[PDB]
């Protein structure tokens, strides 16, 4: 018992910058700082933007602010706290059945607005700042207009699908692939986030 370890916090290590005319990834913390911050849960870096790049000791993925909550996938974060300026912050939402977790959005972050357009022309934002057109095919699936190897999508769970007007439509959860080629993506619809918030 005396030697049982604690898991680290999720740490924000960068962002996908969507503020201008060009989407691009920025790193804000390197590996040594990430490891230290995961242990203390104390991250004094300034946070900006809607889409964060996040890491644990073993994985890296995305997290997206919508309605004042920073959302990501359970299969990346588990039940972990997130690092913040005053120490670890406990999840305010956890739903393994939806593959969804959320923490209060970091000070400095900006939130996407939930889409009410009812549009099926979507855009997936990856951890490499690719903006991939996706045609909505149901409540929680969309097809890639141009299929890609799953290598391209790995590490982007937790990122957003957006409508033409830049509203949040969903959170990327899983790739639908055959022979290593992603033809479609599954996502957690924003309506499901809004229900979880109640
Ligand atoms: C569901 C279906 C149709 C059978 O498909 C698939 O299972 N396909 C696979 C294809 C894997 C190849 C890589 C694909 C590339 C990118 C994938 C987006 C991604 C990712 O980037 N993760 S990550 O590297 O950032 C990672 C660090 C965070 N997610 C995954 O890998 C997830 C994770 C795992 O699924 C889950 O644990 N759960 C738990 C769930 C609970 C409820 C509901 C769910 F659906 C759940 C899905 C399998 N996954 C797939 O996608
Ligand atoms: Zn919209």
Numbering used by the authors: 983 to 1180
Original authors' sentences:
The HCV NS3/4A protease – a chymotrypsin-like serine protease – is a prime therapeutic target that cleaves four known sites along the virally encoded polyprotein. In this study, we report that four chemically representative protease inhibitors – telaprevir, danoprevir, vaniprevir and MK-5172 – exhibit distinct susceptibilities to the protease variants R155K, A156T and D168A. To elucidate the underlying mechanism by which chemically diverse inhibitors bind to the wild-type protease and drug-resistant variants, crystal structures were determined for 16 inhibitor-protease complexes.
Relative to the wild type, R155K caused large reductions in potency for danoprevir and vaniprevir, but MK-5172 remained highly active (R155K IC50 = 0.55 nM). For both danoprevir and vaniprevir, the R155K mutation disrupted the favorable cation-π stacking interactions with the P2 isoindoline moieties, causing significant reductions in drug potencies. R155K and D168A mutations confer danoprevir and vaniprevir resistance by disrupting favorable cation-π stacking interactions with R155.
